[PDB]
Ligand SMILES: Nc1nc2c(ncn2[C@@H]2O[C@H](COP(=O)(O)OP(=O)(O)O)[C@@H](O)[C@H]2O)c(=O)[nH]1
């Protein structure tokens with residue numbers, strides 16, 4: 491069998507890094523660091539959840555859990571239709587003391603559109619005034635030992651957070667009060683500081699994956715400059731020397747896996763003849779320049795037709811490139827990954843904003859030039875809406891020289907706001 495994959499999402503300063511760090515802690519099958527991910531064998535999970543499984547009734551049917559730290563939008567890297575190949579389930583981290591934030595809200599909307607199951611970590615409960623910690627305890631067990639004032643503050647903050655979620659269209663319940671997984675999103679109070687609530691969280695993640703979610707699937711999660719690719723192997727086997735095709739900026743990329751690399755526990759990496767799901771692995775291969783984050787990775791077998799596979803891997807990006815106005819009058823859009831780009835196109839289509847040009851990866855002069863033609867065509871739309879992407883300095887300079895506006899945002903809403911402001915300025 492294989493291990494479910496869990497992605498951890500959160501607003502900055504919400505304690506996701508500290509949380510994953512606390513989840514990693516061990517007395518040591520050992521918890522093992524992998525490329526862009528951390529693997530938890532079922533024994534380690536049993537140990538971390540034992541305190542909330544004292545009777546032993548809970549059955550683990552799973553070999554392990556893979557957890558990917560996904561700060562920002564990497565959990566949404568691939569196209570929506572394949573979301574489960576990247577993340578079976580997610581953990582959304584919210585600071586209980588400040589409640590819902592904008593990045594959190596965007597994360598919520600994106601998780602909902604992609605139909606990605608998630609639970610919420612209501613983190614930093616130790617910040618409750620007078621909280622009496624019991625390290626690594628289950629939340630209920632610790633909560634029972636708190637004074638009246640602490641319980642009161644918890645309930646108040648909880649009701650408030652529940653309201654903020656309700657406004658966003660999500661019905662939420664405290665996890666042990668939660669009765670139906672289909673009806674409510676579970677809120678699990680946690681402390682990255684004390685470890686409290688983490689047993690509950692791991693047990694719940696495992697429970698949901700098993701109860702609800704009981705061919706090769708591999709996704710390019712990151713591209714690192716020679717150029718190597720960090721890949722999440724969700725299903726199947728990858729082997730050294732495998733003939734692979736993936737999505738590239740200027741067309742399909744076809745090459746052969748030179749090396750399968752994981753971090754050394756010495757040299758820097760250890761090589762593998764082969765790796766099996768679920769695994770985060772680094773791939774070394776010639777000609778990986780222009781690889782697209784969020785791209786599928788396909789292996790060309792003996793019966794397979796490499797051309798058809800090239801077409802198939804490029805088809806995601808092409809499906810995005812084709813989503814443009816027939817009129818040819820519209821804005822240019824750009825994003826870092828297939829999923830982010832898809833989200834941007836869907837959002838703008840909802841906003842009835844017309845798009846004439848679609849780009850992926852960091853913004854370069856060619857993208858800005860392409861936008862610049864609109865300036866001759868229809869000047870008002872000679873702008874770029876750029877979602878979570880870097881803008882090359884020369885591209886920005888060229889834009890400023892030629893009166894092309896480049897709008898950038900970490901949140902998709904802001905692109906809309908900025909564009910509306912721009913249009914009102916043009917009509918002003
Ligand atoms: N008291 C307390 N502090 C926390 C907790 N989780 C995170 N922090 C603090 O908040 C800061 C958040 O750090 P980090 O883990 O990088 O949060 P991130 O930016 O969302 O990844 C850290 O300096 C921690 O000291 C918690 O459960 N309790």
Ligand SMILES: [Mg+2]
Nearest residue numbers: 502506507561
């Ligand atoms: Mg972080």
